[PDB]
Amino acid sequence: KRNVELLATLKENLERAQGSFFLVNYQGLPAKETHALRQALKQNGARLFVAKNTLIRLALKELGLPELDGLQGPSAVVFYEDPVAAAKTLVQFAKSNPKGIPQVKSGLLQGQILTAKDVEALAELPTMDE
Amino acid sequence: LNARRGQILGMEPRGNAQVIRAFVPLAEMFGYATDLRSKTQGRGSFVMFFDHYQEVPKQVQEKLIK
Amino acid sequence: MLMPRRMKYRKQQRGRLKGATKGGDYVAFGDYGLVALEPAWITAQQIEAARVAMVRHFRRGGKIFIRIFPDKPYTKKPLEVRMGKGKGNVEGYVAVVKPGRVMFEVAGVTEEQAMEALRIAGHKLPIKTKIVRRDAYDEAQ
Amino acid sequence: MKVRASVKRICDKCKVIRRHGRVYVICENPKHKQRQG
């Protein structure tokens, strides 16, 4: 009850290796399209951290229990988390804003963000690279 | 073809159109033209030639011994 | 199929089938077994039918153990004859089998595989059966 | 319809039902339709 335990920690570890986690709704991209928009933010965002997409449920117990600013942007819906700090991003979210907002009908769409340690915002996070 | 105790050899294109090569026992080619025409809407055709002989099935052979 | 090779006597009295088995009640060799839920004289051809069925399931293959063997000769008079004029002819051989006997065992096979196998084997037998599986209770005996 | 003493699921789309006193197996594939009897 369960590997939801080994899964939380692995999200904490990858959060406890940051201060700046963003969050995207990786919805309907195929597989071709997917290993693209992913390998994208691995060649524009260090290590191998594009998204470590996991359960909205466990991704709020983690932000909750590191306290990490209560990431309550919107953990509703499909939710993936573009770990911008286990990388080395900045306006490298532009690497997101350019792939999604052209190669789809709403490609890698964004939801929440917490730069430095401070809550980023809605379109004010989604323009945080324009 | 298989259902007629045949054994198929291969498939190539022609007048496009296609061709299918097979060894079937002659005992199973009687009045073929008509099933062929049924199975192909009266649009296919065939040629057929003796190639060789071989051991009829142990379950055919011993019916024949009458 | 099964039958003694030689016998001290050729025909035997019919006897009676009261009782739980005498023994044979615990799994002895395999992992899975099939126990008689009711009395019966089981026939050589019935055993054989079941055995065969089992091998056919495994294809190749596991291990079948057969724990009953028919040493009772079964007698029958010729069709259409009257009573009298001596005991009937041996026409086959049977195994007396009382409830709780483990009749067949299997091994070297998956759970799914031994279950099914014993199911089919059951269907060739003229009694109720249950499938069982080795236990501490078996080993303890 | 098949009518038998033994009625049973034949494929995974087979479904065992009880109408009006009788056990039927209904299925997408009409060959599996059974009614016990």
């Binding site: - | - | 089992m54 091998v55 293959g61 070297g108 069982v132 209770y137 | -």
Partner: protein
């Protein structure tokens, strides 16, 4: 790995009564004592299906004694495949004769060749102090092809822990393995 079990004393109670009552009539003895016990079936079952005649089971009698026992026999009712009676042996500090599991490590060359590991012993007899009861004994069966066996004579063996059966006692065998191809004949 050392299991426990409430166990109670009994005198004149008809076994039928007890059995009806969910309980399992039994007996405890060694050479110093012999007492009539009963244990709740379902509690007994849960333990013995792991303990068996292999591990110690500690009987917690009402007088607050806690005796260490091995199960020595279990009488099954033949018709209904169930326990009617148990014999708990009260272990003392002497060496004891008992049964030690065999763990068959390895995949036989015989298996993996179509064939089957007839495991003729799933445990083995052993003289031994209760104080070093080996919960295991491994046997490598890797060098076995269809045709081979292994006797007690092999068998590594801890300390100590001697045998308690002839060494010439065959313990495992690899045998050929049912074949539809045979059938027809």
């Amino acid at each position: 790995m050392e299991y426990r079990l409430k166990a109670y004393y009994r005198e004149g109670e008809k076994p039928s009564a007890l059995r009806r009552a969910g309980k399992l009539p039994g007996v405890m003895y060694n050479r110093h004592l012999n007492r009539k016990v009963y244990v709740d079936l379902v509690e007994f079952d849960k333990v013995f299906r792991q303990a068996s005649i292999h591990h110690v089971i500690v009987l917690e009698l009402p007088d607050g004694q806690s005796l260490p026992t091995l199960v020595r026999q279990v009488n099954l009712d033949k018709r209904r495949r169930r326990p009617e009676h148990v014999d708990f042996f009260v272990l003392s500090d002497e060496p004891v004769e008992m049964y030690v599991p065999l763990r068959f490590v390895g995949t036989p060359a015989g298996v993996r060749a179509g064939g089957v590991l007839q495991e003729i012993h799933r445990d083995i007899l052993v003289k031994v102090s209760p104080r070093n009861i080996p919960e295991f004994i491994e046997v490598d069966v890797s060098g076995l092809e269809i045709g081979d066996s292994l006797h007690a004579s092999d068998l590594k063996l801890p300390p100590g822990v001697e045998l308690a059966v002839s060494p010439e006692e065959t313990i495992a065998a690899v045998v050929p393995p049912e074949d539809v191809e045979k059938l027809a004949e």
